[PDB]
Amino acid sequence: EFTFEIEEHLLTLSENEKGWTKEINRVSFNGAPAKFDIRAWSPDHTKMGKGITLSNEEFQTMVDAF
DNA sequence: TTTT
Numbered sequence: 685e686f687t688f689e690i691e692e693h694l695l696t697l698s699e700n701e702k703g704w705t706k707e708i709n710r711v712s713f714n715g716a717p718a719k720f721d722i723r724a725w726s727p728d729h730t731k732m733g734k735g736i737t738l739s740n741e742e743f744q745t746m747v748d749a750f
Numbered sequence: 751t752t753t754t
Contacts, residue, residue, distance in 0.1 A: 731753075
């Protein structure tokens, strides 16, 4: 058992020939408070690809650093 | 090529 919900779309970074997009979103996993999520997504966003989840703290650390 |  596992669930996901894209709560907010922040940025699309690129799209490939199959229409999958790399995105920065706020995503809730298993109904938890949403985290930052940098991940590939199928065209209708019904299939997840490879990516990483970052807490607000981890994301701000990254932003401050670059 | 693709699932926390």
